[PDB]
């Protein structure tokens, strides 16, 4: 069946996740207040939320078994390219198909199409993003699968700028086989039907979403009054050729 190592890896990712994703969203009070006046009225709040989320994705990444054997250069490359993707992935936990929004426990912290569209990004991003959420939601992944996907997403050997791809690849396959085996031994059919194929496809959707994000990020970061509403970490990770 599974494996002691694999069960070890799973146990670690679940805990790493519980330590980096607060289901109460208590820290959201500290962000610059949300303003639902693009009016860019949401940019200060969503910028802080994203920035904060980058810090949590980094924290989760460090606990990914094997990520520590990578060099800083590789670790930095992997996080710079995966951050936004993992943030869209982990956000699935708060997304509800009831009203197609990210319900972050609180009306002020409940975000929908018109809110996330008020931060300088267009529907060319938001449309596919919600679609992504729905499709991912419909997979009804076990939380074990959820964290494995986030981890696999982080340690992808094909990210531009990777050095020791072999090591990155080794680390990822380990996670993949853990995933493939868990689905087979722990995810009952029919819900297990082509589940691994449907999760890997979501990794392809994320690249696409990531690509569109880079395009729209640069667009608004090339405008000084906008880039000054962001945070220093966002500028570092997403780009600061402003």
């Amino acid at each position: 069946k599974l494996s002691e190592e694999q069960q070890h890896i799973i146990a670690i990712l679940l805990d790493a996740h519980h330590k980096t994703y607060d289901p109460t969203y208590a820290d959201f009070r500290d962000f610059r207040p949300p303003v639902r006046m693009s009016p860019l009225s949401m940019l200060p709040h969503l910028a802080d939320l994203v920035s904060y989320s980058i810090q949590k994705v980094i924290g989760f990444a460090k606990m990914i078994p094997g990520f520590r054997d990578l060099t800083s250069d590789d670790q930095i490359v992997l996080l710079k390219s995966s951050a936004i993707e993992v943030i869209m992935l982990r956000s699935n936990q708060s997304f509800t198909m009831d009203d197609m929004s990210w319900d972050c426990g609180s009306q002020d912290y409940k975000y929908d199409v018109t809110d996330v569209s008020k931060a300088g990004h267009t529907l060319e991003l938001i449309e596919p993003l919600i679609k992504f959420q729905v499709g991912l939601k419909k997979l009804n992944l076990h939380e074990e699968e959820h964290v494995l996907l986030m981890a696999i997403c982080i340690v992808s050997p094909d990210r531009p700028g990777v050095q020791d791809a072999k090591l990155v690849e080794a680390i990822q396959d380990r996670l993949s086989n853990t995933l493939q085996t868990y689905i087979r031994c722990r995810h009952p059919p029919p819900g297990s039907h082509q589940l691994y194929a449907k999760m890997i496809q979501k990794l392809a959707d994320l690249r696409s979403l990531n690509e569109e994000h880079s395009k729209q990020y640069r667009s608004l970061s090339f405008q000084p009054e906008n880039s000054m509403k962001l945070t220093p970490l966002v500028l570092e990770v997403f780009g600061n050729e402003i």
Partner: peptide, 11 residues
Amino acid sequence: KNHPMLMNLLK
């Protein structure tokens, strides 16, 4: 390639 904040958060 010079990401003090990211670098610092990673170590």
